[model samples]
Target chain A: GPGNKGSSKREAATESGKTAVVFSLKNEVGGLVKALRLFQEKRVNMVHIESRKSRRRSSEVEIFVDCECGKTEFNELIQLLKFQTTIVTLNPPENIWTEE
Target chain B: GPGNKGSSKREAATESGKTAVVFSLKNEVGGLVKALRLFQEKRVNMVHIESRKSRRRSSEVEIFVDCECGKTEFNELIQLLKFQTTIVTLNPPENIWTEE
Candidate 1:
């Protein structure tokens, strides 16, 4: 009831004409920040960040970052990120809101 | 499926020890009044709050609050609400159980 209204509106304005990219990464925060920085450098904004537990260990984490950017930029960022951390999953921008 | 045992067990213990909280804020609303008031006054505790989509070109939202307080104090706070213009979904503490 607080900021939910404004956030969705911002997303509608900035993200409606774009796409939503979702991808999971390793647990480390360093890697997460690196990925976020890459998105910032490219002027892409992150919609949300969801965290999950890694099956390998209790200390490890699995993160999913949703962003509004094209495949080319995503691929470029993933290429650089994969070298830094394991990219467990990557889905196209259309997958977030649409399901078949 | 491997860690499902431990996770499920955690859910079991969580059944007796944990509760749930839900709310979504408006675009113009801020300062965390609802979240502050709920836990501070009743001490029911919150597990999560998921945001919603506002339809005034996505400008507002509806929030739902769920808690586990043994029903003693929940009846005390309906007065502060009726004036707020929104829709909400509130569930009881029992509903969280069997979510597994």
Candidate 2:
């Protein structure tokens, strides 16, 4: 569920003890590809990645990552992410529910 | 607007002179409490603090702050938050309007 849309990837919530990572990143496709690879190397199972248009930049994206790890792994990932210059941010997933 | 809902806690928009401070906390309730106290001492009028769940960790939260102060106060708060190390990230409130 971490790639482009309409790819039959689903973001079903993971089981207990897992963590969901979310981040906003630059919108360049090349940069995004590298980010995904980094996640892969860390073996962080991505349950989803969503893209949002930023009002500040034309080529910026916001991604949501859900993985099967606890808080420990999430912290390590955030540390690694921050070290990378290309990644604009490394955020944890926050659930906001609204009824329409 | 600064505390929990329905507790008569208010977040009145300052009369165009105050700044709104918002930060995603590490979910350490004690740490968040301290950070808020620091904000109060610095005269940062919190416009709001809405709790949301972080799927990555069990106790992380995202906060939204709207202030009357312009960019100057906001930047200063960001710096202060960083120094405290309790803040996760400082983000500007993006305006998004959709007609239903």
Candidate 3:
């Protein structure tokens, strides 16, 4: 009741022609910053980001971005990040929304 | 099949006289770093931390610490954190795990 409005707005934005990346990372200092910097360096606009500690002992993070990055850029980002964390899933919202 | 050992070890550590703080936070830059800093300043041993983006448009983070801090320190931590987040819940593991 208290946060429904904000929640709906975010959902709308996420589905509005953006790609959402969901992944799990180690919960260490600089872990979040390092991952986010990858997006920034590539000029990807991070529309929204969310993170939580997982039962699996990792930081589960979801990020929404405005850039439909090229395959090369996406691959590079993932490659660089994988050295530090695990990628749970990555794709546009439509791909996963239906399953949910 | 894999990672079960690591996962089980973390679960055991969490339930061993540690306090867990579960909360939702605005998924903004510096939001996470700031929250963790609080724990660091208080000498709270962050045994484990995890985070994920919520369907409700926030970062849902769970933190495990090896400190059963004093009432005042705990309250202060919550109060300071509340300024930047909505704490879903906080307690020792036994309080919630049994229900789960």
Candidate 4:
């Protein structure tokens, strides 16, 4: 059965589609929480969050979003996150997560 | 100049080499900090920490560690982390970070 990780209603509501951004953040308390709050502040809905820890070292985080907001708003938020965190990669809005 | 993100001395000191274990953590306050502290308690040196924000959704975190400790100690720590957080993936010790 298809999982409810991402629902159809959420996907349809996103006027500007969605995108996945990869971040390399400093391993600090509240780092992930601080970043997520940014999206909520902008009124964007975060559909999924996934992370991988580097063996014997640091770790990596991957996020998938359902964005109803426009590009300008989205880019502005990204800029802020980049300034505050180590952003490894950012992909423009697409159907990256739904297919898989 | 060659970057010092991963120092050679640290790399050589790791008898069992190094590995990158990627973790998908809950985007909550103190999540990243808590995970890093585990390594510290186990006497493993965390070399680097990186993260990416997923577009307008949840963010991802990546960690790199230098393991002077043996396999038993390393696996034990991983098991604890897995139990505590959402560990998406864990790679065995290797030359994963130093090369890049």
Measured by DockQ, the strongest candidate is 3
Q: How well does candidate 4 score on lDDT at residue B77?
A: 83
Off by over 4 Å in 1: A1-26, A29-31, A54-59, A92-100, B1-100
Fnat per candidate: 0.00, 0.00, 0.02, 0.00
What i-RMS does every model get?
9.3, 16.6, 5.7, 8.1
The per-model lDDT (C-alpha) reads 0.47, 0.54, 0.54, 0.57
Candidate of highest lDDT: 4
After TM-score superposition, what is the CA distance of residue A25 in candidate 2 from its true location, in Å?
2.5
Model 3: lDDT of residue A68? 51
For every candidate, C-alpha RMSD to the true structure in Å: 12.7, 19.0, 13.1, 12.9
lDDT of 2 by residue, A10-62 (tens): 78755567565556566543344455566666666444344344467565565
The DockQ values of the predictions, listed in order, are: 0.04, 0.02, 0.12, 0.06
State the lDDT at B48 in candidate 3: 43
- For residues B1-100, write the lDDT of model 4, one tens digit per residue: 8776764564454465555566656655445556666776776654434444454565544443334456778888888888876675666546565655
Worst 10 residues of 4 chain B by lDDT: B60-69
**Candidate 2 lDDT for residue B57:** 55
Pick the winner on TM-score between candidates 1 and 2: 1
- Give the TM-score, chain B only, in order for the candidates: 0.44, 0.52, 0.53, 0.60
What is model 3's DockQ versus the real complex? 0.12
> For residues A1-100, what per-residue lDDT tens digits would candidate 3 score against the true structure?
7865674453333332335566555555445556666665665535444444436643543433324556667678777766676765675455433211
Q: Which ten residues in a row have the lowest lDDT in candidate 3 chain B?
A: B7-16
Would you estimate the TM-scores of all the predictions?
0.36, 0.34, 0.37, 0.37
